[PDB]
Amino acid sequence: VPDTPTRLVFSALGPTSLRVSWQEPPLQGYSVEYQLLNGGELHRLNIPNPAQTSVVVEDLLPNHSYVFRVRAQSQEGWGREREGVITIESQVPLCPLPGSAFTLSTPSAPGPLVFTALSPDSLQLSWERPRRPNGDIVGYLVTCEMAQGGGPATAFRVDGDSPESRLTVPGLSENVPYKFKVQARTTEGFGPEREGIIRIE
C-alpha cells in the first residue's frame, strides 16, 4: 500500500480557513479527513490528482479544535494516515501585522512566533511554551536560513523550560528574507515545528 505522508503542514488563511499541505515520499490521489476533536461530523475531501498536495478548508469554527488526517490511495489500497490537531484562535498592542488577529495552535507546538527587529542586522524571537508537550521539555531547536535557498542553516539550542523563551539572532544580512523554524525537544523527542519567514526593514 502507499506510504504514509511524510509531512503535514498547516497555514491559517483567516479566522475560519486554513491551507493543509502534505508531502509523499503511482497513486490515484489522496483523502483529507477532518472533524471537530469532540464528536463532530466527519468531513472527507477526495483529491483526484496525485500532483495536488494542498487544499484550502473553509468554514471552520474559530477557537475549536479539529483533527485532520491525510492518506494516499493506490491500486493496492489506502495507506496509513498522517494526523494533526489544529485550532485557529482569534478574539471572541503588538505591531499590527496583517493576519495578526488570528493564529494557528496545536497542543505540542511552540506558541506563535513573536519577532522584534532590534537593528538592521539583528532580531529577537520569542515563543510561548507548548501547552501540552509530549513529555517534559528539555529545550528548543531554532534554525535560521536564507529563505531563497543556497546557503547553510544556523541552528541554535535554547536550553530550559521557561514559560516564555527568547533568542537573539545576530549577523542577518540587511533586507534579506530569512526562514525560521522552532521546535520543542522533549524527553520523548521532537515536537511539531513552527515556521515563518521574516525580512528586517
Binding site: 503542514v9 505591531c95 527587529a117
Partner: peptide, 24 residues
C-alpha cells in the same frame, strides 16, 4: 512564499507561522 516584514523599533510583532508535523 509569505514574508513578514519587520520594522526596526516597532517592537514585538506577531507573525503568521505554519505548523508542520513530520520532517521536510
Amino acid at each position: 512564499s509569505n514574508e513578514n516584514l519587520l520594522l526596526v523599533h516597532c517592537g514585538p510583532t506577531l507573525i503568521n507561522s505554519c505548523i508542520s508535523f513530520g520532517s521536510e
